[PDB]
Short mmCIF file of C-alpha atoms and ligand atoms in Angstrom, two decimals:
data_model
loop_
_atom_site.label_atom_id
_atom_site.label_comp_id
_atom_site.label_asym_id
_atom_site.label_seq_id
_atom_site.Cartn_x
_atom_site.Cartn_y
_atom_site.Cartn_z
CA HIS A 26 -64.40 -76.02 -46.05
CA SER A 27 -66.87 -78.72 -45.05
CA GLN A 28 -66.86 -77.62 -41.39
CA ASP A 29 -67.49 -73.91 -42.04
CA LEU A 30 -70.20 -72.62 -39.74
CA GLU A 31 -71.54 -70.59 -42.68
CA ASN A 32 -72.95 -73.92 -43.90
CA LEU A 33 -75.31 -73.87 -40.91
CA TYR A 34 -76.54 -70.29 -41.36
CA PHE A 35 -79.84 -71.67 -42.71
CA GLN A 36 -80.45 -73.22 -39.28
CA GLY A 37 -81.80 -71.35 -36.30
CA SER A 38 -79.33 -69.58 -34.04
CA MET A 39 -80.31 -71.92 -31.22
CA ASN A 40 -78.83 -75.34 -31.86
CA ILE A 41 -77.33 -78.37 -30.18
CA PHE A 42 -73.99 -76.62 -29.53
CA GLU A 43 -75.68 -73.70 -27.76
CA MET A 44 -77.82 -76.20 -25.85
CA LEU A 45 -74.78 -78.08 -24.54
CA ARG A 46 -72.98 -74.80 -23.87
CA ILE A 47 -75.80 -74.16 -21.36
CA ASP A 48 -76.09 -77.72 -20.01
CA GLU A 49 -72.43 -78.79 -19.81
CA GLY A 50 -70.40 -75.64 -20.46
CA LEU A 51 -67.66 -74.56 -22.83
CA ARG A 52 -63.92 -74.39 -22.15
CA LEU A 53 -61.64 -72.67 -24.65
CA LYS A 54 -58.36 -73.77 -23.03
CA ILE A 55 -57.14 -77.34 -22.56
CA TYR A 56 -58.05 -78.65 -19.12
CA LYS A 57 -58.10 -81.96 -17.26
CA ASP A 58 -61.48 -83.68 -16.93
CA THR A 59 -62.66 -85.67 -13.90
CA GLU A 60 -60.41 -88.59 -14.87
CA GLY A 61 -57.37 -86.35 -15.38
CA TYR A 62 -57.56 -86.44 -19.19
CA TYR A 63 -56.85 -83.47 -21.45
CA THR A 64 -60.08 -82.07 -22.86
CA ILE A 65 -61.27 -78.89 -24.60
CA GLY A 66 -64.42 -77.31 -25.95
CA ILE A 67 -67.62 -79.05 -24.88
CA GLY A 68 -66.22 -82.24 -23.41
CA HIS A 69 -63.99 -83.10 -26.37
CA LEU A 70 -61.42 -85.63 -25.19
CA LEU A 71 -58.06 -84.99 -26.82
CA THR A 72 -55.99 -87.92 -25.53
CA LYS A 73 -55.38 -90.09 -22.49
CA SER A 74 -51.67 -89.21 -22.65
CA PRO A 75 -50.23 -87.51 -19.54
CA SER A 76 -48.27 -85.23 -21.89
CA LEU A 77 -49.75 -81.78 -22.49
CA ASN A 78 -47.67 -81.58 -25.68
CA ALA A 79 -49.40 -84.74 -26.91
CA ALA A 80 -52.80 -83.18 -26.20
CA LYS A 81 -51.72 -80.03 -28.04
CA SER A 82 -50.61 -82.19 -30.97
CA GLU A 83 -54.03 -83.85 -31.18
CA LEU A 84 -55.77 -80.47 -30.91
CA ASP A 85 -53.68 -78.98 -33.73
CA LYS A 86 -54.53 -81.92 -36.00
CA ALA A 87 -58.25 -81.46 -35.31
CA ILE A 88 -58.35 -77.65 -35.64
CA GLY A 89 -55.86 -77.11 -38.46
CA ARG A 90 -53.43 -74.65 -36.85
CA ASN A 91 -50.95 -74.26 -33.99
CA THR A 92 -53.30 -73.43 -31.13
CA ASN A 93 -50.94 -73.78 -28.14
CA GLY A 94 -53.97 -75.21 -26.37
CA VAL A 95 -56.39 -72.28 -26.88
CA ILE A 96 -59.29 -72.22 -29.35
CA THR A 97 -62.13 -69.88 -30.26
CA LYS A 98 -65.82 -70.49 -29.63
CA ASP A 99 -66.35 -71.10 -33.36
CA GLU A 100 -63.51 -73.64 -33.40
CA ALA A 101 -65.09 -75.40 -30.42
CA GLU A 102 -68.41 -75.55 -32.30
CA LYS A 103 -66.69 -77.19 -35.29
CA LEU A 104 -65.16 -79.80 -32.97
CA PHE A 105 -68.52 -80.35 -31.26
CA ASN A 106 -70.38 -80.67 -34.55
CA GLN A 107 -68.04 -83.50 -35.56
CA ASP A 108 -68.82 -85.21 -32.25
CA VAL A 109 -72.58 -84.73 -32.88
CA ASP A 110 -72.31 -86.32 -36.32
CA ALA A 111 -70.63 -89.34 -34.74
CA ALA A 112 -73.26 -89.56 -32.00
CA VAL A 113 -76.06 -89.41 -34.59
CA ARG A 114 -74.42 -92.17 -36.65
CA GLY A 115 -74.39 -94.29 -33.51
CA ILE A 116 -78.04 -93.51 -32.75
CA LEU A 117 -79.00 -94.54 -36.28
CA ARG A 118 -77.22 -97.90 -35.86
CA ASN A 119 -78.98 -98.63 -32.58
CA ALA A 120 -82.20 -100.62 -32.94
CA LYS A 121 -83.45 -99.21 -29.63
CA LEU A 122 -82.90 -95.52 -30.52
CA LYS A 123 -83.29 -95.22 -34.29
CA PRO A 124 -87.12 -95.47 -34.37
CA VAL A 125 -87.63 -92.70 -31.80
CA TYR A 126 -84.90 -90.49 -33.28
CA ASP A 127 -86.35 -90.77 -36.79
CA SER A 128 -89.82 -89.90 -35.50
CA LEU A 129 -88.73 -86.73 -33.68
CA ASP A 130 -88.69 -83.18 -35.00
CA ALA A 131 -85.37 -81.32 -35.07
CA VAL A 132 -85.68 -79.65 -31.66
CA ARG A 133 -86.63 -82.88 -29.91
CA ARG A 134 -83.82 -84.67 -31.75
CA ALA A 135 -81.44 -82.23 -30.07
CA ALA A 136 -82.90 -83.21 -26.70
CA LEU A 137 -82.26 -86.90 -27.42
CA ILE A 138 -78.70 -86.16 -28.54
CA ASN A 139 -78.22 -84.17 -25.32
CA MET A 140 -79.21 -87.28 -23.36
CA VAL A 141 -76.76 -89.44 -25.34
CA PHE A 142 -73.93 -87.02 -24.59
CA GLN A 143 -74.76 -87.20 -20.88
CA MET A 144 -75.36 -90.93 -20.42
CA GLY A 145 -74.32 -92.79 -23.61
CA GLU A 146 -76.45 -94.89 -25.94
CA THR A 147 -76.82 -97.73 -23.45
CA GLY A 148 -78.09 -95.31 -20.82
CA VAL A 149 -80.62 -93.64 -23.10
CA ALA A 150 -81.77 -97.00 -24.48
CA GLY A 151 -82.74 -97.99 -20.93
CA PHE A 152 -85.65 -95.51 -21.05
CA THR A 153 -87.81 -97.95 -23.03
CA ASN A 154 -91.22 -96.69 -21.87
CA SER A 155 -90.40 -92.98 -22.10
CA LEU A 156 -88.89 -93.41 -25.58
CA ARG A 157 -92.06 -95.18 -26.74
CA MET A 158 -94.12 -92.28 -25.37
CA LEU A 159 -91.95 -89.85 -27.32
CA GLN A 160 -92.32 -91.93 -30.47
CA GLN A 161 -96.11 -91.81 -29.98
CA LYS A 162 -95.97 -88.01 -29.46
CA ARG A 163 -97.30 -88.40 -25.89
CA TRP A 164 -95.23 -85.44 -24.80
CA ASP A 165 -96.75 -84.64 -21.41
CA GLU A 166 -96.70 -88.30 -20.36
CA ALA A 167 -93.09 -88.70 -21.48
CA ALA A 168 -92.16 -85.60 -19.47
CA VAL A 169 -93.82 -86.98 -16.34
CA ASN A 170 -92.15 -90.38 -16.72
CA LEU A 171 -88.70 -88.90 -17.34
CA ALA A 172 -88.98 -86.76 -14.19
CA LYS A 173 -89.33 -89.92 -12.04
CA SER A 174 -85.88 -91.16 -13.10
CA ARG A 175 -82.47 -91.18 -11.49
CA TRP A 176 -81.35 -88.96 -14.38
CA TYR A 177 -83.54 -86.20 -12.94
CA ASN A 178 -82.06 -86.65 -9.46
CA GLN A 179 -78.49 -86.58 -10.82
CA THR A 180 -78.76 -83.30 -12.75
CA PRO A 181 -82.14 -81.74 -11.93
CA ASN A 182 -81.65 -78.40 -13.66
CA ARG A 183 -80.27 -79.80 -16.91
CA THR A 184 -82.80 -82.62 -16.89
CA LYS A 185 -85.69 -80.18 -16.36
CA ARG A 186 -84.59 -78.19 -19.42
CA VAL A 187 -84.23 -81.31 -21.59
CA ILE A 188 -87.64 -82.56 -20.43
CA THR A 189 -89.24 -79.18 -21.20
CA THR A 190 -87.73 -79.47 -24.68
CA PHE A 191 -89.40 -82.87 -25.15
CA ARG A 192 -92.63 -81.52 -23.67
CA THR A 193 -92.89 -78.42 -25.86
CA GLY A 194 -90.72 -79.02 -28.93
CA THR A 195 -89.36 -75.51 -28.42
CA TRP A 196 -86.22 -73.92 -27.07
CA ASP A 197 -88.19 -72.14 -24.33
CA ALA A 198 -86.22 -73.69 -21.46
CA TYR A 199 -82.94 -72.43 -22.93
CA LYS A 200 -84.29 -68.98 -23.73
CA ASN A 201 -85.54 -68.78 -20.16
CA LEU A 202 -82.21 -69.94 -18.70
CA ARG A 203 -80.25 -67.39 -20.73
CA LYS A 204 -82.58 -64.59 -19.67
CA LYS A 205 -82.39 -65.57 -15.99
CA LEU A 206 -78.60 -65.50 -16.03
CA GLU A 207 -78.54 -62.23 -17.98
CA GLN A 208 -80.91 -60.54 -15.59
CA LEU A 209 -78.99 -61.83 -12.57
CA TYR A 210 -75.67 -60.67 -14.06
CA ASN A 211 -77.25 -57.26 -14.73
CA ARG A 212 -78.01 -56.88 -11.01
CA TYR A 213 -74.27 -57.08 -10.26
CA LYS A 214 -72.50 -55.66 -13.31
CA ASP A 215 -70.38 -52.52 -13.09
CA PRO A 216 -72.49 -49.62 -14.46
CA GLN A 217 -69.31 -48.30 -16.13
CA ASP A 218 -68.09 -51.60 -17.63
CA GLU A 219 -70.70 -54.12 -18.71
CA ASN A 220 -67.96 -56.76 -19.11
CA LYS A 221 -67.42 -57.14 -15.36
CA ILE A 222 -68.90 -57.08 -11.90
CA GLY A 223 -66.94 -54.65 -9.75
CA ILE A 224 -66.39 -54.33 -6.01
CA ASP A 225 -69.91 -52.97 -5.37
CA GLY A 226 -71.44 -55.80 -7.37
CA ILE A 227 -69.37 -58.39 -5.54
CA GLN A 228 -70.63 -56.86 -2.29
CA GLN A 229 -74.25 -57.10 -3.47
CA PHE A 230 -73.60 -60.69 -4.54
CA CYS A 231 -72.25 -61.48 -1.07
CA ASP A 232 -75.21 -59.73 0.60
CA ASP A 233 -77.67 -61.71 -1.55
CA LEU A 234 -75.87 -64.89 -0.45
CA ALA A 235 -75.96 -63.89 3.25
CA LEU A 236 -72.17 -64.10 3.37
CA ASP A 237 -69.96 -61.92 5.47
CA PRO A 238 -67.81 -60.38 2.71
CA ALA A 239 -64.87 -61.17 5.02
CA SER A 240 -65.59 -64.92 5.07
CA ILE A 241 -63.24 -67.38 3.39
CA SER A 242 -66.40 -68.69 1.70
CA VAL A 243 -66.23 -65.68 -0.63
CA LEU A 244 -62.76 -66.71 -1.80
CA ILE A 245 -63.99 -70.31 -2.13
CA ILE A 246 -66.68 -69.08 -4.52
CA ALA A 247 -64.07 -67.12 -6.50
CA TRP A 248 -62.01 -70.33 -6.75
CA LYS A 249 -64.99 -72.35 -8.00
CA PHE A 250 -65.67 -69.56 -10.53
CA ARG A 251 -61.97 -69.63 -11.60
CA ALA A 252 -61.84 -65.87 -11.14
CA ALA A 253 -58.69 -64.36 -12.57
CA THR A 254 -58.22 -61.43 -10.19
CA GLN A 255 -59.52 -60.07 -6.91
CA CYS A 256 -62.03 -57.18 -7.00
CA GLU A 257 -63.26 -58.19 -10.50
CA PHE A 258 -65.71 -60.89 -11.57
CA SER A 259 -65.89 -61.00 -15.37
CA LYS A 260 -69.08 -61.72 -17.27
CA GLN A 261 -67.52 -64.91 -18.65
CA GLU A 262 -66.44 -65.99 -15.16
CA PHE A 263 -69.96 -65.46 -13.84
CA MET A 264 -71.69 -67.28 -16.71
CA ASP A 265 -69.20 -70.16 -16.84
CA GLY A 266 -69.37 -70.59 -13.07
CA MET A 267 -73.16 -70.59 -12.79
CA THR A 268 -73.18 -73.11 -15.67
CA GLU A 269 -70.62 -75.46 -14.15
CA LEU A 270 -72.32 -75.27 -10.75
CA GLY A 271 -75.74 -75.96 -12.28
CA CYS A 272 -77.29 -72.80 -10.82
CA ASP A 273 -79.65 -70.31 -12.44
CA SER A 274 -80.53 -68.45 -9.22
CA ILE A 275 -78.99 -67.10 -6.03
CA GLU A 276 -81.02 -69.57 -3.96
CA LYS A 277 -79.46 -72.45 -5.87
CA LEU A 278 -75.95 -71.00 -5.56
CA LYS A 279 -76.50 -70.51 -1.82
CA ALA A 280 -77.30 -74.23 -1.53
CA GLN A 281 -74.03 -75.05 -3.37
CA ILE A 282 -71.74 -73.16 -0.95
CA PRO A 283 -71.56 -75.95 1.68
CA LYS A 284 -70.71 -78.41 -1.09
CA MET A 285 -67.80 -76.22 -2.20
CA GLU A 286 -66.60 -75.99 1.39
CA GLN A 287 -66.77 -79.79 1.72
CA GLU A 288 -64.58 -80.24 -1.33
CA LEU A 289 -61.72 -78.53 0.53
CA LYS A 290 -61.51 -81.36 3.06
CA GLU A 291 -59.52 -83.26 0.43
CA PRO A 292 -55.85 -82.17 0.74
CA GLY A 293 -55.54 -82.28 -3.06
CA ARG A 294 -58.44 -79.87 -3.47
CA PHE A 295 -57.21 -77.59 -0.72
CA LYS A 296 -53.81 -77.47 -2.44
CA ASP A 297 -55.57 -76.45 -5.67
CA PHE A 298 -57.48 -73.73 -3.80
CA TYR A 299 -54.33 -72.61 -2.00
CA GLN A 300 -52.35 -72.32 -5.24
CA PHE A 301 -55.26 -70.55 -6.95
CA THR A 302 -55.15 -67.88 -4.24
CA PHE A 303 -51.70 -66.68 -5.34
CA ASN A 304 -52.64 -65.88 -8.93
CA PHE A 305 -55.99 -64.44 -7.81
CA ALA A 306 -54.43 -62.06 -5.26
CA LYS A 307 -51.50 -60.91 -7.40
CA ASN A 308 -51.78 -57.71 -9.39
CA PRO A 309 -52.03 -58.68 -13.09
CA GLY A 310 -49.28 -56.20 -13.93
CA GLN A 311 -46.79 -57.76 -11.47
CA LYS A 312 -44.88 -61.04 -11.54
CA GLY A 313 -44.85 -61.63 -7.77
CA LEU A 314 -47.22 -60.96 -4.89
CA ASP A 315 -46.61 -58.00 -2.58
CA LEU A 316 -45.65 -59.19 0.88
CA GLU A 317 -48.46 -57.30 2.64
CA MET A 318 -51.08 -58.86 0.34
CA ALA A 319 -49.47 -62.27 0.75
CA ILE A 320 -49.72 -61.96 4.55
CA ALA A 321 -53.41 -60.99 4.34
CA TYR A 322 -54.30 -63.96 2.15
CA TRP A 323 -52.06 -66.34 4.12
CA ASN A 324 -53.91 -65.38 7.29
CA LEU A 325 -57.26 -66.02 5.61
CA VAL A 326 -56.43 -69.38 4.05
CA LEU A 327 -53.94 -70.88 6.52
CA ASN A 328 -55.43 -69.98 9.91
CA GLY A 329 -56.09 -73.23 11.74
CA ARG A 330 -54.06 -75.21 9.17
CA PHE A 331 -50.47 -73.93 9.52
CA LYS A 332 -49.38 -74.48 13.11
CA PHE A 333 -46.70 -71.77 12.90
CA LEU A 334 -48.83 -69.06 11.28
CA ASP A 335 -48.50 -66.68 14.23
CA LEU A 336 -44.69 -67.01 14.20
CA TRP A 337 -44.74 -66.62 10.41
CA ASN A 338 -46.52 -63.29 10.84
CA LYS A 339 -43.95 -62.04 13.33
CA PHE A 340 -41.06 -63.19 11.11
CA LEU A 341 -42.47 -61.43 8.05
CA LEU A 342 -43.46 -58.24 9.85
CA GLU A 343 -39.80 -57.69 10.73
CA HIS A 344 -38.86 -58.29 7.05
CA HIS A 345 -38.37 -55.82 4.21
CA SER A 346 -42.42 -59.60 -2.94
CA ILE A 347 -43.31 -63.33 -2.95
CA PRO A 348 -42.83 -65.49 -6.09
CA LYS A 349 -45.22 -68.29 -6.95
CA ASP A 350 -42.79 -71.04 -5.99
CA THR A 351 -42.29 -69.64 -2.48
CA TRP A 352 -46.05 -69.35 -2.00
CA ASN A 353 -46.57 -72.93 -3.18
CA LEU A 354 -43.80 -74.44 -1.06
CA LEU A 355 -45.07 -72.90 2.19
CA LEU A 356 -47.95 -75.39 2.06
CA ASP A 357 -45.53 -78.29 1.62
CA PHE A 358 -43.52 -76.97 4.58
CA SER A 359 -46.68 -76.77 6.70
CA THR A 360 -47.53 -80.39 5.85
CA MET A 361 -44.17 -82.01 6.67
CA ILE A 362 -42.84 -79.92 9.56
CA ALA A 363 -42.70 -81.39 13.04
CA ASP A 364 -44.34 -79.64 15.95
CA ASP A 365 -40.88 -78.42 17.09
CA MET A 366 -39.34 -78.06 13.57
CA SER A 367 -36.80 -80.77 14.49
CA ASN A 368 -37.22 -82.61 11.15
CA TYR A 369 -36.45 -79.70 8.81
CA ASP A 370 -34.04 -80.66 6.03
CA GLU A 371 -31.84 -77.65 5.24
CA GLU A 372 -30.65 -79.40 2.05
CA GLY A 373 -34.23 -79.72 0.73
CA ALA A 374 -34.07 -76.71 -1.61
CA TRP A 375 -36.72 -74.81 0.31
CA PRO A 376 -36.89 -71.08 -0.44
CA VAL A 377 -34.36 -68.97 1.43
CA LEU A 378 -37.34 -67.31 3.12
CA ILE A 379 -38.28 -70.62 4.75
CA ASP A 380 -34.68 -71.47 5.69
CA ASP A 381 -34.51 -68.10 7.43
CA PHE A 382 -37.88 -68.69 9.11
CA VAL A 383 -36.72 -71.96 10.67
CA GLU A 384 -33.69 -70.15 12.10
CA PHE A 385 -35.88 -67.25 13.30
CA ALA A 386 -38.25 -69.60 15.11
CA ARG A 387 -35.42 -70.97 17.30
CA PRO A 388 -35.89 -68.62 20.32
CA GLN A 389 -39.64 -69.29 20.44
CA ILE A 390 -39.20 -73.06 20.10
CA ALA A 391 -36.54 -73.09 22.82
CA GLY A 392 -38.61 -70.93 25.17
CA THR A 393 -41.63 -73.22 24.84
CA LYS A 394 -39.45 -76.25 25.61
CA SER A 395 -38.34 -74.64 28.89
CA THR A 396 -41.87 -73.55 29.89
CA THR A 397 -43.84 -75.52 32.47
CA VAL A 398 -47.08 -77.05 31.21
C1 O37 B 405 -62.16 -62.30 1.49
C2 O37 B 405 -60.97 -62.26 0.56
N1 O37 B 405 -61.22 -61.26 -0.52
C3 O37 B 405 -61.76 -61.77 -1.64
O1 O37 B 405 -62.09 -62.96 -1.69
C4 O37 B 405 -62.13 -60.91 -2.67
N2 O37 B 405 -63.03 -61.49 -3.71
C5 O37 B 405 -63.14 -61.11 -4.98
O2 O37 B 405 -62.65 -60.06 -5.38
C6 O37 B 405 -64.07 -61.81 -5.76
C7 O37 B 405 -63.81 -61.88 -7.13
C8 O37 B 405 -64.60 -62.66 -7.97
C9 O37 B 405 -65.62 -63.46 -7.46
C10 O37 B 405 -65.84 -63.44 -6.08
C11 O37 B 405 -66.86 -64.22 -5.54
C12 O37 B 405 -65.02 -62.69 -5.24
C13 O37 B 405 -62.32 -59.40 -2.38
C14 O37 B 405 -63.63 -59.12 -1.95
C15 O37 B 405 -64.33 -59.78 -0.95
C16 O37 B 405 -65.65 -59.45 -0.67
C17 O37 B 405 -66.31 -58.49 -1.42
F1 O37 B 405 -67.57 -58.19 -1.14
C18 O37 B 405 -65.64 -57.85 -2.46
C19 O37 B 405 -64.32 -58.18 -2.74
C20 O37 B 405 -61.36 -59.08 -1.32
C21 O37 B 405 -60.83 -57.98 -0.86
C22 O37 B 405 -61.05 -56.58 -1.44
N3 O37 B 405 -60.04 -58.26 0.17
N4 O37 B 405 -59.92 -59.59 0.32
C23 O37 B 405 -59.39 -59.72 1.45
C24 O37 B 405 -58.11 -60.24 1.15
C25 O37 B 405 -57.28 -60.86 2.09
C26 O37 B 405 -57.80 -61.17 3.33
C27 O37 B 405 -59.11 -60.85 3.59
C28 O37 B 405 -59.88 -60.34 2.56
C29 O37 B 405 -61.01 -59.93 -0.35
#
């Protein structure tokens, strides 16, 4: 088949796909991009349709099988290589980019393609002076000029690697990035399972970040890393997370923590974090979340947000598993409920647990109403 990766075995192992895997990241399951559009692989837009089934239909046509929205790394490379061929055709039609592209060696061509993926042809074509320097093989001067640009300020770590590629004509910046992340992962990995960081490694990670391991900030990091389960941090989770956060060091990750915290000020992002917590805390082998574990995580994530959290604790402690829908709807209850619960709609199809809670809260509510200020 024309797309077979065996047709590229004459190339080096480092290539444009592996470059963008480092600079942008790779997703093997359909996800929504910044604009809400279904995407997979390295930034491959599937459709603007709101229908996941439509996105799956487009993916199946492009891959050649029924994927149910999940592909392999090799399949993602085939999709990406088609996108590269299209980007190169565009470069070759562009009077502002063709001369420099033609003049460049293969490694530096990859750096230019990287730029086009990030900012489009129009954006790259704006770099008139730097492109002329590249065409003249004035590598150090091009590197200096590119570093003065807004591009550098927008994505400093990616831009530094692309600039180093123009400066040297080698893959050194990508070899160095990979080694840094490998050596950092090796500081944390479980000595008995190289595929994960265990509890001791998570503790070392927290210590290196100057985080109380009991801070909600730890769970915020797990959310940003899309961690599947508490007490484990898989190698893929660590590498994908450091990539998506643009960090190759603990110092850089430490600087990102306040930005992750700030994201939660949006109710939509807090809801995402709140819903993530359920699947993260649940035992993989169980369908629901044990009540005691639910209470612990509820107290971490809802303290200061749910005005009836203390009453909720008392209600549950006098109770005898929590499904996902009950977990999710507690946040909606917290958002709508009046300070005295007077606006609760019993016909609203809330979980029985919440119906019972509203009834249980009646003595406390009444007592407060008869208490002097
Ligand atoms: C504070 C809530 N938390 C967690 O967020 C856990 N994090 C994870 O595993 C983890 C997984 C992947 C990636 C990252 C960054 C974290 C885990 C834990 C915390 C600190 C620690 F160094 C080791 C483990 C844990 C434990 C054992 N308990 N919980 C408590 C649960 C409920 C309330 C308070 C804390 C925590």
